Amino acid sequence: GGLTCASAPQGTLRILEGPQQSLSGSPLQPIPASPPPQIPPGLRPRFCAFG
């Protein structure tokens, strides 16, 4: 009436919960790159010679 060893298991199942990968879009930056410093339009000379 006691507990005895039974037949060895024939296989093992290991369960884990996993989600999946999306598409590669690689959206690097809101406003991207190093935007260049640049000329103010027209500007004009702010200096003249004497005479």
Place this chain on the structure above:
Amino acid sequence: ATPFIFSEENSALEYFGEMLKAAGYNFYGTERLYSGISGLELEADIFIGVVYYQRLRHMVSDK
């Protein structure tokens, strides 16, 4: 003057020389001076500009 904003293609000297030439000065930043001692226009045109100087805390009055 942020580092790494001006490349080989877009140079800093090109940019600021265009800025200067747009004000009536010359591209390369050289304006020609006179000698305040002899009164003659020096043969070489000088490189003049505006730079930010700091004054250090080490004075001959303390050393």
